[PDB]
Coordinates of C-alpha atoms in Angstrom, one line a residue:
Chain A
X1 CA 0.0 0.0 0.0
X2 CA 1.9 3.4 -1.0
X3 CA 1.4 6.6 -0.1
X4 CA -1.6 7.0 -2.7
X5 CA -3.2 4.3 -1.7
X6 CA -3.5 5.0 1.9
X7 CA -4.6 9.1 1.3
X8 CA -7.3 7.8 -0.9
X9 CA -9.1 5.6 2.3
X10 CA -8.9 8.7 4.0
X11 CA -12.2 8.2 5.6
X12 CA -14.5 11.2 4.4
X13 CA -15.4 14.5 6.2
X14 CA -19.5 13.6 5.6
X15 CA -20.9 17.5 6.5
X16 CA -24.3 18.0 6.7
X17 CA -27.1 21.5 8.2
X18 CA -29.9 21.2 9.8
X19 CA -32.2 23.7 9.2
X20 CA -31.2 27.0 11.9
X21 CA -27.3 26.6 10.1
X22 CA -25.8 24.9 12.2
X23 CA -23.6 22.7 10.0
X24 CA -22.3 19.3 11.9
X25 CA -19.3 17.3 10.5
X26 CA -17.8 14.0 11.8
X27 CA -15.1 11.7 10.9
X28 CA -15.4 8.3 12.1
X29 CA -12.7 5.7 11.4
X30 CA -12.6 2.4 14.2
X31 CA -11.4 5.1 17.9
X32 CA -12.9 4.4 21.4
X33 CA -12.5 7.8 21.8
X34 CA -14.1 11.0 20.3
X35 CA -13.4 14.7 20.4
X36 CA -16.6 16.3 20.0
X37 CA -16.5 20.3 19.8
X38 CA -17.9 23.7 18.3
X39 CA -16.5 25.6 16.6
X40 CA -18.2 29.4 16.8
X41 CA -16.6 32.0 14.3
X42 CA -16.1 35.0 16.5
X43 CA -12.8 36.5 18.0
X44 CA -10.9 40.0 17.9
X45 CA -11.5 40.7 14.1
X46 CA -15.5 41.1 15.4
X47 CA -15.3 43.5 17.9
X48 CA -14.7 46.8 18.0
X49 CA -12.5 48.9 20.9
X50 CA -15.0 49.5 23.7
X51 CA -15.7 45.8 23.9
X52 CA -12.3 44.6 22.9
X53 CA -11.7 41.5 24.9
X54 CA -15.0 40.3 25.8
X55 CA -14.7 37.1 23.6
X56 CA -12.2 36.0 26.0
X57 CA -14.4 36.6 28.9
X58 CA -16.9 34.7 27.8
X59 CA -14.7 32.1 26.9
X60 CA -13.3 32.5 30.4
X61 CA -16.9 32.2 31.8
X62 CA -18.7 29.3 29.7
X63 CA -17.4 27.0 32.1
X64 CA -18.0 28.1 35.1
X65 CA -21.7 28.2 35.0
X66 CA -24.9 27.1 33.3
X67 CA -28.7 28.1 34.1
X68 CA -29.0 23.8 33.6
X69 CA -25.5 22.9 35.4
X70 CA -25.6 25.6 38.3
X71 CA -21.7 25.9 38.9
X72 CA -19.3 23.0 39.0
X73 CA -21.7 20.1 38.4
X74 CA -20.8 21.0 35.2
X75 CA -16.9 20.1 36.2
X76 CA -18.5 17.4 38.1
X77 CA -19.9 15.7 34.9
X78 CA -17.2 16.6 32.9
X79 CA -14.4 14.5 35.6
X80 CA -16.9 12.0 35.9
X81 CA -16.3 9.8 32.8
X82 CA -12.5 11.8 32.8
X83 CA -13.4 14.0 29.3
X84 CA -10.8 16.5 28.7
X85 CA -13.3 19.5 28.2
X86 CA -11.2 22.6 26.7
X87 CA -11.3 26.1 24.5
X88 CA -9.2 27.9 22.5
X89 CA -10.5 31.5 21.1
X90 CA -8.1 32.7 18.2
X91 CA -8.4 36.2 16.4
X92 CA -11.2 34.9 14.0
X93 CA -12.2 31.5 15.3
X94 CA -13.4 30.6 19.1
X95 CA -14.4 26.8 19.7
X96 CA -14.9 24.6 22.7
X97 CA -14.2 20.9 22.5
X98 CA -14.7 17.5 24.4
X99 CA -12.0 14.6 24.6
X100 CA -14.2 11.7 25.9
X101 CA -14.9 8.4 25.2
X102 CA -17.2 7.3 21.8
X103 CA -19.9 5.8 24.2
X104 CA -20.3 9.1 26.4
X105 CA -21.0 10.6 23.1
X106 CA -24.5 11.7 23.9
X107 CA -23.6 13.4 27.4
X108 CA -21.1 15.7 25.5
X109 CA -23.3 16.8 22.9
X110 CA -25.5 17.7 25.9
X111 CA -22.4 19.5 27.7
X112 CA -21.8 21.7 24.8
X113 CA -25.2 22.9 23.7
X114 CA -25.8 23.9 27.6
X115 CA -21.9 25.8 27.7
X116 CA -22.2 27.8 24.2
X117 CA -26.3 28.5 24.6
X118 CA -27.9 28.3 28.3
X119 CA -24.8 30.3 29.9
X120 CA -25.5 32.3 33.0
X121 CA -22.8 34.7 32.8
X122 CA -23.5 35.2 36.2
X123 CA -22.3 38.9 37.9
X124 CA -20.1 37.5 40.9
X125 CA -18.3 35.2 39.1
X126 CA -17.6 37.7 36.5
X127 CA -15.9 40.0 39.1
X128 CA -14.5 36.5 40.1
X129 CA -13.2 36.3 36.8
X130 CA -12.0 39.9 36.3
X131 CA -8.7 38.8 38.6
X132 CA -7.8 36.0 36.4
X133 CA -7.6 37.8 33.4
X134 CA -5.7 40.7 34.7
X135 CA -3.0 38.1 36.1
X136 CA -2.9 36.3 32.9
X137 CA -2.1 39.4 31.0
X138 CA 0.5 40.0 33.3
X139 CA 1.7 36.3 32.2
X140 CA 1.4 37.4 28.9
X141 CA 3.4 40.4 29.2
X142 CA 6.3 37.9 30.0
X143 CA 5.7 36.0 27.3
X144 CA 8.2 37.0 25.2
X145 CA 7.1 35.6 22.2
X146 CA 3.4 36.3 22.5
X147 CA 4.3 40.2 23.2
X148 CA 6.3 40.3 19.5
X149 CA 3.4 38.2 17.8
X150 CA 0.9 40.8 19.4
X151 CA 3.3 44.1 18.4
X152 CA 3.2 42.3 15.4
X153 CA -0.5 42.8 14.9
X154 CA -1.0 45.8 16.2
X155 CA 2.0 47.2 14.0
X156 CA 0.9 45.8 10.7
X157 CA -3.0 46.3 10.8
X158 CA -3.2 49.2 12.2
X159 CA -6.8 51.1 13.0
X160 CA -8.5 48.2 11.7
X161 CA -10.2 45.2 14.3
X162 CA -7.0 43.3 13.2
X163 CA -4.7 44.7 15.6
X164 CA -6.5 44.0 18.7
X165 CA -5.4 41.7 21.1
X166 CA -7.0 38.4 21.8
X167 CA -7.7 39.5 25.2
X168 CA -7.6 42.6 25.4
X169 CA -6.3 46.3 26.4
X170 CA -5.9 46.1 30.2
X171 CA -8.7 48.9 31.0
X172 CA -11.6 46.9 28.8
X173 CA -11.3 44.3 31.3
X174 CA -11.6 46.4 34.0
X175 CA -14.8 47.9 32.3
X176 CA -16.8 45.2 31.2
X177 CA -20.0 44.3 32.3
X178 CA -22.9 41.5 32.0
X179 CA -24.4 43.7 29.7
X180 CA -21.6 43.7 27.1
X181 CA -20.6 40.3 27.4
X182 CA -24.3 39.6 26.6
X183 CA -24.3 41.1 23.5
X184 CA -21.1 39.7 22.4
X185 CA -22.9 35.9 22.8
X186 CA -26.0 37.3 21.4
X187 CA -24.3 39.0 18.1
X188 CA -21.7 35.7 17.2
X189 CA -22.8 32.7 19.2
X190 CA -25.1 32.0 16.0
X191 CA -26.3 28.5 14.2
X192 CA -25.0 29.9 11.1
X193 CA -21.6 30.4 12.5
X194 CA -21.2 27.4 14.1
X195 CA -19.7 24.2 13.1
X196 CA -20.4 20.8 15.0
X197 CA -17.7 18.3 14.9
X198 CA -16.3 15.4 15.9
X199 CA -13.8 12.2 15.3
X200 CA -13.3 8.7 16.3
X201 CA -15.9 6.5 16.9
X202 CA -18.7 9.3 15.8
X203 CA -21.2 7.5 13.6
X204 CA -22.5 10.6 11.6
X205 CA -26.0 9.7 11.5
X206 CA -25.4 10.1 15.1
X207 CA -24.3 13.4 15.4
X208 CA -26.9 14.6 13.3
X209 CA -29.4 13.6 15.4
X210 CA -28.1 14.4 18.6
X211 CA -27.6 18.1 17.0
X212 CA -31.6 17.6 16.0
X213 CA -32.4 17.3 19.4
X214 CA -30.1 19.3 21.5
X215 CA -29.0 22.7 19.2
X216 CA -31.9 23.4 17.4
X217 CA -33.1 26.5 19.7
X218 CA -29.8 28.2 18.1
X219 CA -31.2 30.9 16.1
X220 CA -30.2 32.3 12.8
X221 CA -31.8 35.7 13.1
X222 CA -30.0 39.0 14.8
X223 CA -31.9 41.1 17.4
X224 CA -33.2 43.8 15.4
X225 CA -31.2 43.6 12.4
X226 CA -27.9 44.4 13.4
X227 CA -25.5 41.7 11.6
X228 CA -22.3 42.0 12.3
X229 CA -20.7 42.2 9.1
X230 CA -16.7 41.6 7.9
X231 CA -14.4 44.4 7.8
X232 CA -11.9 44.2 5.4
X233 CA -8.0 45.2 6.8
X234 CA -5.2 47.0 5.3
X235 CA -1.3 45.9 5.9
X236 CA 0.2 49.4 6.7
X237 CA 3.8 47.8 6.4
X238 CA 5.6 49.1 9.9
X239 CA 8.2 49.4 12.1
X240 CA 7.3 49.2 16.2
X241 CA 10.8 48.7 18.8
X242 CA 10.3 48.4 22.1
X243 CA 13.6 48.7 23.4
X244 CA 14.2 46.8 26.5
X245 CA 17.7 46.0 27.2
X246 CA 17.0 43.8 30.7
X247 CA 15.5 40.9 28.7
X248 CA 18.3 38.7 27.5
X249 CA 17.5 37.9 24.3
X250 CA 16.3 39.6 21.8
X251 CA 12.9 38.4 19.7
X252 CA 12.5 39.9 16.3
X253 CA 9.2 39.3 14.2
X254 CA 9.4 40.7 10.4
X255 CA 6.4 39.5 8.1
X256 CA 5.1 40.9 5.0
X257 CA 1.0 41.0 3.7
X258 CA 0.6 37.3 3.1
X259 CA -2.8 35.5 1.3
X260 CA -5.8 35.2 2.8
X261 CA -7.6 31.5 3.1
X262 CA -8.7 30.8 0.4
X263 CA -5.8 31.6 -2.3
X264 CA -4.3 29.3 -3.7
X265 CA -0.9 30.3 -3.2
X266 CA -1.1 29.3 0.5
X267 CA 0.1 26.1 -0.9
X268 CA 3.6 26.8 -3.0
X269 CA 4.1 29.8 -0.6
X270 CA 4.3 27.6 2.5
X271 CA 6.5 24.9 0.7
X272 CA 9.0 28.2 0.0
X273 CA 8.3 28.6 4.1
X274 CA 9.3 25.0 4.4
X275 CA 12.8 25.8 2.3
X276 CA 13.6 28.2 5.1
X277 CA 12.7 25.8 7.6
X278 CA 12.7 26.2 11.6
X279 CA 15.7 25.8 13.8
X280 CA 16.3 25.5 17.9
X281 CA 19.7 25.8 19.7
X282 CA 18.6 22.1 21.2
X283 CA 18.0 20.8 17.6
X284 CA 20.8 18.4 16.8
X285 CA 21.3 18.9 13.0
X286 CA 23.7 21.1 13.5
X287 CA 25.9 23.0 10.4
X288 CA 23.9 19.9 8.5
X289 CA 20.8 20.9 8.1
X290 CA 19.3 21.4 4.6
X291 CA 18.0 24.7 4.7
X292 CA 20.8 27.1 4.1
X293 CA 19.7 30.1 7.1
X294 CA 19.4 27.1 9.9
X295 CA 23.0 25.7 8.5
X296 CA 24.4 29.4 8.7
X297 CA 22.9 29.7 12.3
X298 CA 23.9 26.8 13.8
X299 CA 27.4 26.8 12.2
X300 CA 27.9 30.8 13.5
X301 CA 25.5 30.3 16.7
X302 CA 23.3 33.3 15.8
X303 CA 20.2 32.8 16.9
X304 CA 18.5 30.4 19.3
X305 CA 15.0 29.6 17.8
X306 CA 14.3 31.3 14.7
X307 CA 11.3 29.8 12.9
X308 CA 9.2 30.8 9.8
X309 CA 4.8 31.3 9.9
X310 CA 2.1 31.7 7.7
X311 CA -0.4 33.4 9.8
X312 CA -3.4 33.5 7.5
X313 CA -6.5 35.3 8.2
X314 CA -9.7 35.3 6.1
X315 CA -8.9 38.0 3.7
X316 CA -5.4 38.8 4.2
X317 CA -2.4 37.2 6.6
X318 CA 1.1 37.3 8.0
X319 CA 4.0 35.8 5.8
X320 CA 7.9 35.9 7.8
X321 CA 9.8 34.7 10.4
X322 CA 10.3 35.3 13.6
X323 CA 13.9 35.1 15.4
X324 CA 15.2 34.7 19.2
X325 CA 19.1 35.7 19.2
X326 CA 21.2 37.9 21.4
X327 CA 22.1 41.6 21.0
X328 CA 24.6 41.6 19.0
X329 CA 23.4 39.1 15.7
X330 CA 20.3 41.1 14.8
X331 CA 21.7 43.1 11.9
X332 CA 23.4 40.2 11.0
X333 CA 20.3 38.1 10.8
X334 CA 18.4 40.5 9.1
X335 CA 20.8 40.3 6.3
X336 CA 20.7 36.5 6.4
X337 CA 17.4 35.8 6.3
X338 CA 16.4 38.7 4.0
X339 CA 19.1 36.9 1.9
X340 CA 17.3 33.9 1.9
X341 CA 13.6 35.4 0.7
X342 CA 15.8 37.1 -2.1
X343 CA 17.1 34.0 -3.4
X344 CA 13.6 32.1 -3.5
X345 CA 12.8 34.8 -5.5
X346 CA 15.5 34.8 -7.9
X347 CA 17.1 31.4 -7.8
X348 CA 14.8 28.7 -6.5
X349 CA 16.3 25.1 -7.0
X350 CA 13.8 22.1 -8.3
X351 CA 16.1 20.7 -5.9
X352 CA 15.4 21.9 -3.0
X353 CA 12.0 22.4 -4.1
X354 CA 11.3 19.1 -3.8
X355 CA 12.4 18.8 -0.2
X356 CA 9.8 21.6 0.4
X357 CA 7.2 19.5 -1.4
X358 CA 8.0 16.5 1.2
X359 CA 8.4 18.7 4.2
X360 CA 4.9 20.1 3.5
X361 CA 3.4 17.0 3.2
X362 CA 4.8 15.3 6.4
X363 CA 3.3 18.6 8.3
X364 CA 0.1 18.2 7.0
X365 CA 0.1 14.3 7.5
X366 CA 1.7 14.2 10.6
X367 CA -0.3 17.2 11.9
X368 CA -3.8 15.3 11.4
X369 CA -2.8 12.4 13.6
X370 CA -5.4 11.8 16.8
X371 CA -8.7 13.0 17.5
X372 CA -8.3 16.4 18.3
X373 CA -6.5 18.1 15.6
X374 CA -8.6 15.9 13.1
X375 CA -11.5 18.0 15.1
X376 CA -10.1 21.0 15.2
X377 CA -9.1 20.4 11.2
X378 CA -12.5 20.3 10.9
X379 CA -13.7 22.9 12.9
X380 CA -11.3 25.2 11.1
X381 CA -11.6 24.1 7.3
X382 CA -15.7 24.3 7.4
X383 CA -15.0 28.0 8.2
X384 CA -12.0 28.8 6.6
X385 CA -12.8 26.8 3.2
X386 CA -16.4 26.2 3.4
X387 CA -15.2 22.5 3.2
X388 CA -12.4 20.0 4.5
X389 CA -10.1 19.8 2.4
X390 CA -9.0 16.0 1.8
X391 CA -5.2 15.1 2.0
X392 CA -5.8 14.2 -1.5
X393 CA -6.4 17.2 -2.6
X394 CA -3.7 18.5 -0.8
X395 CA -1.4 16.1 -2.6
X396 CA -2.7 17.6 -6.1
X397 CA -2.1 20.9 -5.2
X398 CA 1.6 20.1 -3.8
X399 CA 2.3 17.9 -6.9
X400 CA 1.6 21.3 -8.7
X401 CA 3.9 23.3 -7.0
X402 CA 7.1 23.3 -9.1
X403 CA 10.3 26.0 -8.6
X404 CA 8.4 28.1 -11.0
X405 CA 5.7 28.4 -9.5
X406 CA 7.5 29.1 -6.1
X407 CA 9.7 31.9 -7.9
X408 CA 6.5 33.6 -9.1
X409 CA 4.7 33.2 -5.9
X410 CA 7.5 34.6 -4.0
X411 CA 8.4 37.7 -6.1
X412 CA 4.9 38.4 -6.2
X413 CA 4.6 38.4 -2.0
X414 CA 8.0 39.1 -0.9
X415 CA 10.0 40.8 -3.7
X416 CA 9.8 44.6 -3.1
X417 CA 7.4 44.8 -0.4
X418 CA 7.2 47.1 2.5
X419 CA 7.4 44.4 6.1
X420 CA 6.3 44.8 9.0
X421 CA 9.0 44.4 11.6
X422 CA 8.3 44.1 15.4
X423 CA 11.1 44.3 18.1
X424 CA 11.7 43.4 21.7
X425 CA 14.1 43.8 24.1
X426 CA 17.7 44.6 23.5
X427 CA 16.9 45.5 19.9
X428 CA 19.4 47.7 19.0
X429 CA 21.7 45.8 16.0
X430 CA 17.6 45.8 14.4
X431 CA 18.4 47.9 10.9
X432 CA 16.2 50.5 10.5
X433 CA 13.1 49.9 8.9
X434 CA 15.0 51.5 5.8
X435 CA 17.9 49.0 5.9
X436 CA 15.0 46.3 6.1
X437 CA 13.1 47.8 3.1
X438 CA 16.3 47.9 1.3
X439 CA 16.9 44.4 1.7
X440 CA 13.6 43.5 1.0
X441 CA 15.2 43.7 -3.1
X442 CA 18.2 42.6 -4.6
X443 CA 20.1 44.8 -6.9
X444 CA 21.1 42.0 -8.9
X445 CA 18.0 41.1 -9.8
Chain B
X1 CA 21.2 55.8 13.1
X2 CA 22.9 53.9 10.3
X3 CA 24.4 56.3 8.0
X4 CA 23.8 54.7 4.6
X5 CA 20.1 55.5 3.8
X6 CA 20.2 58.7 5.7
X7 CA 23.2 61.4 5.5
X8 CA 24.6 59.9 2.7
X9 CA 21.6 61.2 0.6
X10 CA 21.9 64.6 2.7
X11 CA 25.4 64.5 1.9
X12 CA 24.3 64.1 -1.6
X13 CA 22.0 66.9 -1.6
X14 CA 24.4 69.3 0.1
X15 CA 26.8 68.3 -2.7
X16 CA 24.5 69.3 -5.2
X17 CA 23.2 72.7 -3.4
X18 CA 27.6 73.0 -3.7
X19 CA 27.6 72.2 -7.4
X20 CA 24.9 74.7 -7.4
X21 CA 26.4 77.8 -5.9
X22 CA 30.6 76.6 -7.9
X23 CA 28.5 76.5 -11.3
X24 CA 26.7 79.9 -10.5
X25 CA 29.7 81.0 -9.6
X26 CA 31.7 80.2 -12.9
X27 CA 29.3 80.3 -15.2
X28 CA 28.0 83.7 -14.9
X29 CA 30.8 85.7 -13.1
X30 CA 33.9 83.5 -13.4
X31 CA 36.1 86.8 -11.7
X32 CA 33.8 88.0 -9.2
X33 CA 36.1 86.7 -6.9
X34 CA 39.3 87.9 -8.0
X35 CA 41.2 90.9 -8.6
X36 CA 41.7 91.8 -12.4
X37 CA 44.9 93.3 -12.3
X38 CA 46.1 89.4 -12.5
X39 CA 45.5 89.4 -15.7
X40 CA 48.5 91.7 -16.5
X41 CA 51.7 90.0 -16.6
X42 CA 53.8 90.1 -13.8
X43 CA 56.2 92.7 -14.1
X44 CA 59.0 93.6 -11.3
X45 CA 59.0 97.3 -12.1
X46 CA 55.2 98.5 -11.9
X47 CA 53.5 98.2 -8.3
X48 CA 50.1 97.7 -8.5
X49 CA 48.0 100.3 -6.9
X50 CA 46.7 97.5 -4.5
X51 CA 48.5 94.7 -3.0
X52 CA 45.3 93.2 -2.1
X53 CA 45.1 89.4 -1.2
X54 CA 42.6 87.0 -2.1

């Protein structure tokens, strides 16, 4: 059985809507176990700055309470056949899932339609609630990573919903009330946006009927009329430094106005991500490694855990890398990895091409292995898409991808385009944003 | 600041705004600044009626 072979059993994504919107979508194969979860399309793109942060409230406060489960019974349940209940509310997308066993199927189903609809937001526990988040923005703020990632937003997209934080400014927080938080569930916690799923031992017939019979008071309509529409965002390529020379090291983020979701050129553009490849000081590989940047790094000991993204939102996304190395590599980094875009752009090798192909596949193979990330896979894809994508197709579309295409696709994103660079700490060897324009083309070329 | 994008192309400018006033200079006045009495050949019996300097 090759490698066709086995992506063609591939058991299928069967998707189906009942009649308020509410689309479910399972994936059984032969697992005791099941990861049963929505999958609500609401985050910090869909809210505007006096109510910035209140997604993450109410994802802080589903939990704790239902006007069914009255505090935590609903724990109580959930420890009592050991599910793993969790949530997870990204800029666009906020879901809640449950790890348990295929046979406690129909208690789940139940859990999550009293968590995302009969929530009692209750006023004490809010207040409760208020400390937490203050104390986990303070965690935050020494999360040296998340801080660049967030700078990184806010730097980019600026004015528009975009560059909000997940959780919010530090004075919305301290602000909010029942009544906002109520509006928030009311204006996204919708059937239409909202995406049943589950994997394992999930017969989809099922899930279906359990969603019959347990979400079908979700309603479609919106108060009045307000509808909370999309609002597109602009990349105002940027420069933000906050100099900080206490921290030791020094975390750099420099991205440039990526595709949104459904372009194609996700595909070639990540296998040209895949080319630069990610590196940590604890790797291993060593001056060995393939991808030219990592084999400079580890041969010089520049940096400690550089590492390329592809943050991609729905309309527009993030496309760079994002370096951890001391005070005095910076500049030289910036040359090196700058150097590397270049050369995708002038000079990519079928050769290495090739490795990109099969690095991209093992990512997205290896990435949907167990339950949960085939549910959140799922979850993310019926939004994203508007369908799962099969590993199949994903196979066609990386078979396509040749060093052509991967020279087009990077001189038309990188070549010549403004970035947005995001510093931290002892950023001082950080060219100026001039330096880092300059280098953004090649004067050979 | 790093000096390449910035001063150099001040530098330049001041260079040109230079090139500016030298050209002005020569081309529509070459001896404003200068004495015409140079012009006669040096001669060790005359003294010019100014000893003047540049």
């Amino acid at each position: 059985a090759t490698y066709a072979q086995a992506l063609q059993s591939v058991p299928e994504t069967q998707v189906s809507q009942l009649d308020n919107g509410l689309r479910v979508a399972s994936e059984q194969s032969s697992q005791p176990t099941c990861t049963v979860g929505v999958w609500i399309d609401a985050g910090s793109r869909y809210e505007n700055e006096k109510n910035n942060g209140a997604g993450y409230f109410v994802e802080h406060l589903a939990f704790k309470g239902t006007k069914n489960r009255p505090g935590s019974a609903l724990e109580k349940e959930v420890e009592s056949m050991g599910a793993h209940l969790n949530a997870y509310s990204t800029r666009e997308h906020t879901a809640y899932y449950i790890k348990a066993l295929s046979k406690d199927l129909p208690k789940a189903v139940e859990l999550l339609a009293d968590i995302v609809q009969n929530c009692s937001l209750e006023d004490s526990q809010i207040e409760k609630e208020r400390d937490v988040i203050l104390q986990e923005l303070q965690e935050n703020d020494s999360s040296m990573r998340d801080v660049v990632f967030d700078y990184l937003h806010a730097t980019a997209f600026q004015g528009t919903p975009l560059a909000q934080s997940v959780e919010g400014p530090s004075e919305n927080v301290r602000k909010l009330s029942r009544a906002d938080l109520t509006e928030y569930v009311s204006q996204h916690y919708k059937a239409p946006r909202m995406v049943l799923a589950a994997a394992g031992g999930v017969e989809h017939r099922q899930l279906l009927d359990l969603a019959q019979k347990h979400f079908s008071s979700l309603s479609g309509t919106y108060v009045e009329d307000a509808v909370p529409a999309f609002t597109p965002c602009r990349f105002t390529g940027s420069e933000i430094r906050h100099r900080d020379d206490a921290l030791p090291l020094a975390h750099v983020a420099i991205a440039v106005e990526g595709p949104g979701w459904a372009n194609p050129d996700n595909v070639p553009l990540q296998v040209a991500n895949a080319i630069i490849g990610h590196y940590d000081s604890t790797y291993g590989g060593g001056t060995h490694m393939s991808s030219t940047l990592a084999s400079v790094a580890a041969t010089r000991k520049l940096c400690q855990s550089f590492q390329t993204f592809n943050i991609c939102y729905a309309e527009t996304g993030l496309l760079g890398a994002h370096f951890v190395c001391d005070n005095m590599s910076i500049d030289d980094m910036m040359f090196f990895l700058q150097g590397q875009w270049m050369r995708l752009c002038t000079s990519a090798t079928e050769s290495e091409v090739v490795r990109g192909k099969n690095i991209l596949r093992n990512a997205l193979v290896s990435h949907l292995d167990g339950t949960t990330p085939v549910c959140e896979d799922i979850g993310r894809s019926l939004l994203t898409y508007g369908r799962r994508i099969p590993l199949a197709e994903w196979e066609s579309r990386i078979a396509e991808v040749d060093a052509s295409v991967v020279r087009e696709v990077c001189s038309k994103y990188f070549y010549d385009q403004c970035p947005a660079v995001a510093g931290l700490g002892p950023i001082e060897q950080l060219p100026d944003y001039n330096r880092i324009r300059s280098g953004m083309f090649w004067l050979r070329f | 600041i790093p000096f390449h994008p910035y001063y150099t192309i001040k530098d330049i400018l001041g260079a040109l705004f230079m090139m500016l006033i030298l050209l002005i200079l020569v081309l529509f006045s070459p001896d404003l600044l200068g004495d015409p009495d140079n012009y006669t050949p040096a001669n060790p019996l005359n003294t010019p009626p100014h000893i003047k300097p540049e």
